[PDB]
From a paper:
The HER3 KD functions as an obligate allosteric activator and is itself catalytically inactive, despite high-affinity binding of ATP. The role and relevance of ATP binding for the HER3 KD remains to be defined, but emerging evidence suggests a function in structural stabilization. HER3 is not only essential for tumorigenesis but also functions in mediating drug resistance that becomes apparent when HER2 inhibitors are used to suppress HER2-HER3 signaling.
First, we determined whether displacement of ATP from HER3 KD by high-affinity-binding small molecule ATP analogs, all previously characterized as type I inhibitors, could have an effect. However, none of the small molecules suppressed constitutive HER3 signaling driven by HER2 overexpression. Lack of the inhibitory effect of drug binding on HER3 signaling might be a consequence of the ability of these ATP-mimetic drugs to preserve the same conformation of the HER3 pseudokinase domain as ATP binding. To obtain deeper insights into the effects of drug binding to the HER3 KD, we determined the crystal structure of the HER3 KD/bosutinib complex to a resolution of 2.5 Å. The AP-2 pocket is largely conserved between EGFR and HER3, and it encompasses four hydrophobic residues in HER3: F704, L709, W728, and V786. Most importantly, it is connected to K742 in the nucleotide-binding pocket via a network of hydrogen bonds within the β3/β4 strand that extends to V786 in the AP-2 pocket. The side chain of the preceding residue, I741, makes direct hydrophobic interactions with the side chains of L709 and V786.
Author numbering: 680 to 846, 852 to 960
Amino acid sequence: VLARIFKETELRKLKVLGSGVFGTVHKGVWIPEGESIKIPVCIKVIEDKSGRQSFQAVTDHMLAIGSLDHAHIVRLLGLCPGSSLQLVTQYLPLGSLLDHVRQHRGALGPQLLLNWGVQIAKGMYYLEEHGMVHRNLAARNVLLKSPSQVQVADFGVADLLPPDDKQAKTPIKWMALESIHFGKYTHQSDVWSYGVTVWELMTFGAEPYAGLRLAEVPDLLEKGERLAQPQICTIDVYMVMVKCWMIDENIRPTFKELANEFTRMARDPPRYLVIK
Ligand SMILES: COc1cc(Nc2c(C#N)cnc3cc(OCCCN4CCN(C)CC4)c(OC)cc23)c(Cl)cc1Cl
């Protein structure tokens, strides 16, 4: 695939859906010139409020995000350079998997939970096979394309911005220790974030390290503390998560191994998730 470079005139933002550190997200419309059609899209505006740099040039890394497509990632339809960067995707109205599980909780049933572990790993495996480091995997950035199928969103976006060493800006509770301590991001550090994400699913959207201050999270990890075993998880599921949070980057599983292992468990869900 190949992403489109939009003219500013064929994009219109219509409503803010959210706002974080990696930009503001809008419901939008794509109006391709002269075709008499208005296509619903989702628009993420990235503005560098720290250093006030522009995004007028189409970098190799923006083209890399735009040449990826897979059933379990959100395709980047295109972008629109400018003083702020606009990223354009399909609009997925069903929203985020985090909100879904928080609302329905155990009513979702064990098959769907394990199936989603498979799908997120397959999406991540695709991204790894194409050399794309996500840098911000989390249950909030897994989106429902359908009631049963999810897609990994926001891959590559953190790299669109240069680091600011000015003295909360990054998602500490989802990050591998090597990323916190050294700013190093790899497919192996995406595996750590994957383990947190599937922990979010099995707890139905509990907050990781619920009541501790962010400053204290690295020290607890080095001392060997980890997210607790979810109530529905048998020891076999939890052990897959624990291997994801090894400080040794080389002991963590691969995305191929993770998709394989959740495939095997999804073949007999109640032997692995026990939902009262
Ligand atoms: C464009 O670029 C990017 C966009 C995104 N984020 C989203 C992507 C994608 N992709 C796709 N689809 C999304 C749909 C959303 O809202 C749907 C449900 C909300 N409704 C609000 C109003 N009430 C009445 C009903 C529910 C949404 O909300 C925040 C974010 C979405 C990301 Cl994570 C990264 C990049 Cl680079």
